[PDB]
Amino acid sequence: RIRIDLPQDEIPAQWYNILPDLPEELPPPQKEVLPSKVLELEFAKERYVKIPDEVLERYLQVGRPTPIIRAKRLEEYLGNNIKIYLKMESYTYTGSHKINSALAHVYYAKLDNAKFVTTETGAGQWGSSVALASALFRMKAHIFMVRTSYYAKPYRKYMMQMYGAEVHPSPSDLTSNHPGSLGIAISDAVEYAHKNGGKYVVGSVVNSDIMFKTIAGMEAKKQMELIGEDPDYIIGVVGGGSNYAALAYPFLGDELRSGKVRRKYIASGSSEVPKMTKGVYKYDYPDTAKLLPMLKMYTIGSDFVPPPVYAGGLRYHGVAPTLSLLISKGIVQARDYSQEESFKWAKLFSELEGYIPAPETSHALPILAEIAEEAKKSGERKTVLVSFSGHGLLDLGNYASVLFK
Amino acid sequence: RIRIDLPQDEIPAQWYNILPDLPEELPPPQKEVLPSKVLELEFAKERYVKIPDEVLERYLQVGRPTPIIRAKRLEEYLGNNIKIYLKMESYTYTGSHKINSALAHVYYAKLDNAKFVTTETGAGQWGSSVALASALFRMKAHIFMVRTSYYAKPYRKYMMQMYGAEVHPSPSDLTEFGRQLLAKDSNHPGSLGIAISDAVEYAHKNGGKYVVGSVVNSDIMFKTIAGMEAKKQMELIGEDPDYIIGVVGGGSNYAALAYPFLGDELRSGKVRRKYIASGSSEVPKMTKGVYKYDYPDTAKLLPMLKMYTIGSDFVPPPVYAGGLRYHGVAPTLSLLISKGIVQARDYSQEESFKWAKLFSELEGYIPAPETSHALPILAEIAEEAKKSGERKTVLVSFSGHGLLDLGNYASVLFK
Ligand SMILES: *Cc1c(COP(=O)(O)O)cnc(C)c1O
Numbered sequence A: 001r002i003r004i005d006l007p008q009d010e011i012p013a014q015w016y017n018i019l020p021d022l023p024e025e026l027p028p029p030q031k032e033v034l035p036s037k038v039l040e041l042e043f044a045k046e047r048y049v050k051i052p053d054e055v056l057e058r059y060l061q062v063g064r065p066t067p068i069i070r071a072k073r074l075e076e077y078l079g080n081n082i083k084i085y086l087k088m089e090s091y092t093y094t095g096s097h098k099i100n101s102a103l104a105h106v107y108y109a110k111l112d113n114a115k116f117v118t119t120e121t122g123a124g125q126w127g128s129s130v131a132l133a134s135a136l137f138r139m140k141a142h143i144f145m146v147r148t149s150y151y152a153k154p155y156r157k158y159m160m161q162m163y164g165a166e167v168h169p170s171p172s173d174l175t176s177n178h179p180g181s182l183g184i185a186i187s188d189a190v191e192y193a194h195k196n197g198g199k200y201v202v203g204s205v206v207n208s209d210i211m212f213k214t215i216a217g218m219e220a221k222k223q224m225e226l227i228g229e230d231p232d233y234i235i236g237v238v239g240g241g242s243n244y245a246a247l248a249y250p251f252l253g254d255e256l257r258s259g260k261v262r263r264k265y266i267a268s269g270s271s272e273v274p275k276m277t278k279g280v281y282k283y284d285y286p287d288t289a290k291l292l293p294m295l296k297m298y299t300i301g302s303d304f305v306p307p308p309v310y311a312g313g314l315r316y317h318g319v320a321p322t323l324s325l326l327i328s329k330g331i332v333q334a335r336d337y338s339q340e341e342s343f344k345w346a347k348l349f350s351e352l353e354g355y356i357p358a359p360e361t362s363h364a365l366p367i368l369a370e371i372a373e374e375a376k377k378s379g380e381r382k383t384v385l386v387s388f389s390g391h392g393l394l395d396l397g398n399y400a401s402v403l404f405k
Numbered sequence B: 001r002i003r004i005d006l007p008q009d010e011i012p013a014q015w016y017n018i019l020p021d022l023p024e025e026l027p028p029p030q031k032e033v034l035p036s037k038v039l040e041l042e043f044a045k046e047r048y049v050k051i052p053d054e055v056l057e058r059y060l061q062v063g064r065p066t067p068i069i070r071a072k073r074l075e076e077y078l079g080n081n082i083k084i085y086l087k088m089e090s091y092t093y094t095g096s097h098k099i100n101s102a103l104a105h106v107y108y109a110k111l112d113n114a115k116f117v118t119t120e121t122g123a124g125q126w127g128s129s130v131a132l133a134s135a136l137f138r139m140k141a142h143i144f145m146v147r148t149s150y151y152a153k154p155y156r157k158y159m160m161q162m163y164g165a166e167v168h169p170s171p172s173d174l175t176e177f178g179r180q181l182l183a184k185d186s187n188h189p190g191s192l193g194i195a196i197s198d199a200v201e202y203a204h205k206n207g208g209k210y211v212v213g214s215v216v217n218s219d220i221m222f223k224t225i226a227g228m229e230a231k232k233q234m235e236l237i238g239e240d241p242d243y244i245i246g247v248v249g250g251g252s253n254y255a256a257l258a259y260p261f262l263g264d265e266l267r268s269g270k271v272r273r274k275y276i277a278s279g280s281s282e283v284p285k286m287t288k289g290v291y292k293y294d295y296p297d298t299a300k301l302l303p304m305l306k307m308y309t310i311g312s313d314f315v316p317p318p319v320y321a322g323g324l325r326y327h328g329v330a331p332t333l334s335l336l337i338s339k340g341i342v343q344a345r346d347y348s349q350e351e352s353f354k355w356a357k358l359f360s361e362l363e364g365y366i367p368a369p370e371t372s373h374a375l376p377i378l379a380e381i382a383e384e385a386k387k388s389g390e391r392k393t394v395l396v397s398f399s400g401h402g403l404l405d406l407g408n409y410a411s412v413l414f415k
C-alpha cells in the first residue's frame, strides 16, 4: 500500500475549466495555423468539458490513469511530520504530463484535416510528446529542434524519430550552423505550417492547454477520495505552470465556489530564472517569437536568457495567466530555489524512494522541507499532494553537470 | 481495458524453483565472497521459496507488481489473429527485471552482515539495479565498471551515482589485481572478466560480499516474481496463454516469466503451451550454441555450467548493438531447449529494430533493444494461429524500455 491505482475503467471523462470559477475575470489579451476547436475552447464557459472518445482512448494507451504513490521513506527522513503523496505524471510513456495536452491538440488538428503538424522544442520534452501523440493519431509531425539541443541532447531527438516524426535542426533548410533559440524555432515551425498547409501545435501556456492537462487533477481527486485523504497542501513546480494548475485546479475550483479556500497551494520555480519570486505581473509576450497575443502574467521578460550553467529545465520566462491571477490574489503562494539545492534534494529522493525525478520536478522537494519544518513547530501533521511531473532518465546529463564534478 | 493491474496487497509471496520439476536431471554445476543464502539456494529442492518480508517490501517500493498491457494496436496490425499481452518489467524504477534479483542478492548480503556489496558492470544495466537495491537497504555499493564503458555510456553511470553507489572504472587501483594491470596501462580499457576480478578481490579483502549477475539458478528463481505475478494477472481475466515468448541474454528474464507456467505442465506430464525464446543472430547461442560445460563468466571464478554456448571468448561484431551479447544460455533453459520443450529463434538486429520502431509507433512505448528480438516471433505466431481457426493468446516478457538505449537504436536506424 504505497501505490494507489485508479482502474482504467474509472478514468475521469471530463476536463475541468477554471474560468467560470475565478474570483474575477481574466485580463483580456492585448488563427490560420491553429486547430479550430482549440481556439474555441480558450473561451469555454462551461465548468466541465467532455473529453472526446478518441482522446480518452489514447490517454489509456499512454498509461493513464497514473498512480499516486506515498513517499514513506521521505516522510521518515523528514521526521514523519507530514504525509507525502505524489501524483506520478512521470508514469506516462513519454515520462511527463505534456502528453495530456499533446494528444488533444493533435486530435483537434486531425479534425481540421491537417496534412501534418509542426511544433518547436528545445531540450525535447514537448517535441517527444507531440511525436507520440502524432504517431497514435497517425499524423505526420515536423518538429523544429534548436540546433544546439539537437546535437547536445540527442536522445529525445532519437525518441521523436522512433515515434516516426521528422526532426529538423532549427534554423534548417526547409524554412551557417546558427545555434538557434526557442523563439526562432517557433517562427521556424509556425511558418512551415503556414506555407505548407500544416497546423501548428502550440507549446505555450494558454487556457485550453491547462484544461487538457487537468485529467491529472481529476484523477488525483478520485484517488485521494479513494483512500480517504484530503490534502492540506497541493504543491508543484512552474515552467509555464500547466502541470501545477492541472493538478491543483480541480481541487481549488470547488473551494473557490464554496467561498473559502482552506487548502494551501504553493508552487516553485528556479532562482536562476526567478519569474515566481522576482517576476512582475504585467502584460508580456507569451513566447519569445512575439507572435501570440500578449497576456497579463508574472514575467521576467520574454527576452530573458537563462545562464549557461542552468540545467534545471524551468527556462520559461512567465507564468500562465490564470495561475498569475491566482498568485496576485494571494491564493497560490510562490517560491524559488537554486538548482544546487533542488538537485541535492533530487539525489536524496532518488536514494530514499528509488525513483529519479526530472530536474524540473526536483524544485518541488525544497517545498516539502519547508512544510515539514513548519509542521515540526506547530506541531501538527499535514498531508501534501505533489505534482510529480516527470522522471529524469533522459536528463541525467543535467544532474551530472551539477552534482558529479 | 488494456492494462491489468495486480494490487500491491495481492503480490505473490514466494519464488518458483523449477529444479524439482525438470523432466531430466539437470547437470549439477561444476565463496567467502558470496552471500551464504545465495549459495544455499542454488541447490534448493523445495518448489517454492518464501520471499523474505524485507525483500517483498522493496519489491513494492520499486514499482511491483508490474502491469500486463494488452497491445491491441499491434494485434490489429497483425490481423486480429492473436491476442498479445505484455508483462511489463520495464515498469520497475530501473526499467527492467534485473532489480528482481538485485534486491534479493543485497538482502542476503545484509543478512551475512556484509560491510558493503560489490559487482561488475559493463553497459550499466546490472550496476544500476544493484545501486538501487543497495540504496533501498542502506547498503554501501562499490560498482566496478569496465573503464571504456565508464566513459562511453555515462548515463547509466550517472544513474548509479544518483542512487549513491560508488562507481570505480575497472581495472581500478583499489585492488592488487587492478593495480597490476594499471602498471602496464594507466588507462587500461578493461573487460567484463577484469571487472569481475576487481569486484571479487575488493569484497574479499575488505569484508564485503560480491553480488553476481549471471545465470545461476538462484538468480532465475529470484526473478520468477514476474511469472508468479503474470500467472495471477492472466487468471484474473480468464486468459490462459497458448504461447509464452521472450528474449535470451542469459535467459533469466524469459525463464522468470515462463517457468511458473511451465512447471504446472511439467507436473501434469504433458506440455500443451508453446514456449519460444529468441536471441540475436549476431550472437547465436540460441540456434547455434554447442551444448557443453563452459564458464558462465568471461574470466572464470564461477564454476562451469552445462549450457548452450558459443564460447566465453566470443566478442560480437562492433556493429552489433542489440544488447544480447552474452555467450551462453542458463543451464535449466538449455536443458529445456535440448528436450524440445522451449523452441529457439534468432533474428538479426535489422529485423528486430524494424519491429521496435513499428511497435513504438503503434503502441507508443519504446522497447529496450534486447526486448525487440521477441517481436519477430509474433509474425510467426500470427501465421500459425490463422491455420488453427482459433484466436491464440501470446504472453510476452517485455523485459525493459529503451530510453537509455536510444543511441543503440540510432546507430542502426538513424544513419
Ligand atoms: C516541461 C516540464 C515541466 C514544466 O512545464 P509546465 O509548463 O510548468 O507544466 C515540468 N516537469 C517536467 C518533467 C517538464 O518536462
Ligand SMILES: *Cc1c(COP(=O)(O)O)cnc(C)c1O
Binding pocket: B095, B096, B098, B125, B247, B248, B249, B250, B251, B252, B253, B254, B368, B370, B371, B399, B400, B401
Ligand atoms: C540484461 C537484459 C536482458 C537480458 O536478460 P537475461 O535475463 O540475461 O536474458 C533482456 N532485456 C533487458 C531490458 C535487459 O536489460
